[PDB]
Design a protein around this ligand. Structure first.
Ligand SMILES: [Zn+2]
Length: 196
């Protein structure tokens, strides 16, 4: 009833990577290593890199799930707010309720867990292309952190799990997400407070 968030490289040495986008007022998506926190604008492309030390077997998949970071909310399904689930912005594949979409991948599957009712989205793992050392998935987050009735100003975590063809755990990583109007300013502000 609470998905595990424990970091776990496993046998293939799985871990995430993030681009270095800066904190300019105009940035649509930026990542803070010091806070392990991704700041992005509503429904904007969020590149997430997948890094491994060895290639996992064919049929390996990559799943993304969000949970609330505070323990008192951890048991509540993270979902889109009463407004955004009704704004008819589906891409055909993502259910309107799902906060996290994968962008530009026809093989993305969206899951509604029969037991926990949590949402997740899963894609096949593709090894890196020639001339690349990693694989990138593009994610969208489809509500603001502050959406009333939805995330409701609460911070979330996005958990990325490397899975075999049966859904058994091969690797896990995680990062905090804030969806806000101005990712650059918010990352600067929070990183200033962290030193102080
Ligand atoms: Zn919303």
């Amino acid at each position: 009833s609470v998905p595990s968030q424990k970091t776990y490289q496993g046998s293939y040495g799985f871990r995430l990577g993030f681009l270095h986008s800066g904190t300019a007022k105009s940035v649509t998506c930026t990542y803070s290593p010091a806070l392990n926190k991704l700041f992005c604008q509503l429904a904007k492309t969020c590149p997430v890199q997948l890094w491994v030390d060895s290639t996992p077997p064919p049929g390996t998949r990559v799943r993304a799930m969000a949970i609330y970071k505070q323990s008192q909310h951890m048991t509540e399904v993270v979902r889109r707010c009463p407004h955004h689930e009704r704004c008819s912005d589906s891409d055909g594949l993502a259910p309107p309720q799902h906060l996290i979409r994968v962008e530009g991948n026809l093989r993305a599957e969206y899951l509604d867990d029969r037991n926990t009712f949590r949402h997740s989205v899963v894609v096949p793992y593709e090894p890196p292309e020639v001339g690349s050392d990693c694989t990138t998935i593009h994610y969208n987050c489809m509500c603001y952190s502050s959406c009333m009735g939805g995330m409701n100003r609460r911070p979330i975590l996005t958990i990325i799990t490397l899975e075999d063809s049966s859904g058994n755990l091969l690797g896990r990583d995680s990062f905090e997400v804030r969806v806000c109007a101005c990712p650059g300013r918010d990352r600067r502000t929070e990183e200033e407070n962290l030193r102080k």
